[PDB]
Symmetry: D2
Subunit: 116 residues, 4 copies
């Protein structure tokens, strides 16, 4: 279990060391922490979300040695990189007007990873 | 009275009142979001209440705007992820930037009726 | 070969292979969930991929079953599948609000086959 | 009379009803540091901050003409507190626990909800 830390604006790519298949990476104690426009702090455990991204390649034919967070925006780590229900989901931040109020909010992602 | 609208991929989608009055009074009906996936298949979803909820969100604003714009944090124009169809284009299904890049050429359209009450 | 199914409100919904084979080979097409809301309006959503995912979930099971059943358990109801903005947890958040949906209709139609 | 934050705790099988003391409008209740905790069928622990979920439930009454003096957690099943009462994405959501056969594996999982609540006050 090696630790990792990413800050707002980082490109987050989890890569195996020997460029073996990323489907073998597992995660532990992963916390995503962000602020809302009012300045309050929020965090959420995203360990299973990450583990499911790795398991996503479990039955692939050309499995890669990496995966990268970001969605259709290929955007770097930001306050919406993971969902905390009731806080930063689609129903709470539903428009571009609202989402713009969030553009300077902080975001961080820490945790442990290993190959199994 | 009900007036149609249509948007396609790459459009900025802004709903505005003709009276520069509160957008909170705009209502929607038979709104359909349609998109393709990377295999070329077709998917659609009724998004009427999503849009109605967006307008209703200004019901209590002290200085309510006369418009609202679709987009999320990307400030992205209409794309295949502008509305969620569960099991197809949601975060669990499209979870990494690698998988999402396979969608960048998928088409998307949004059509429906809007009026002011 | 594709084959149609229909279920109505209150049905237990169990998709099963005919040959006691592994339910992970079932696939679905043109699956539509339909329900009414408290005001009586009709709502539909395509749940084909949701149902395919429920079958594909069993693909890596050591002793896979010949069936799966919808629910979390309650028979088919207006909340069996989510239509965002209409019947999700954000919109129907409390038991009190959910009570107004007690008599809402619900139906599920589609096609299934084994691959 | 004390007006600040006051703690609550519910556990599995409890009917969870939040209520004002004077039968006034539940739209004025607010929440802070609310945590939903549950186990999974493997016995691992999971927790999630549900403070805004609870605040949105109270705020959802703020426009009713005749608001109630309480609301109850539950959903269509009118169920008491259980491992599925709040969603932790990727652990207990519809995509992760998609069938009755899978959900049945969670029947004996424990769950608790704790937090702070206060009531907004208006004056003349």
């Amino acid at each position: 279990w090696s630790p990792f830390k990413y800050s707002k604006g980082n490109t987050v790519t989890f890569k195996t060391p020997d460029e073996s298949s990323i489907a073998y990476m597992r995660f532990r104690n992963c916390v995503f922490t962000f602020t809302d426009p009012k300045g309050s702090l929020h965090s959420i455990d995203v360990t299973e979300v990450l583990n499911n991204m790795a398991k996503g390649f479990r039955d692939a034919q050309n499995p890669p040695s990496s995966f990268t967070l970001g969605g259709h925006c290929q955007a770097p780590l930001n306050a919406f990189s993971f969902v905390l229900p009731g806080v930063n989901d689609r129903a709470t931040v539903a428009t571009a007007d609202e989402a713009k109020k969030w553009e300077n909010c902080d975001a961080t992602l820490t945790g442990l990873q290993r190959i199994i």
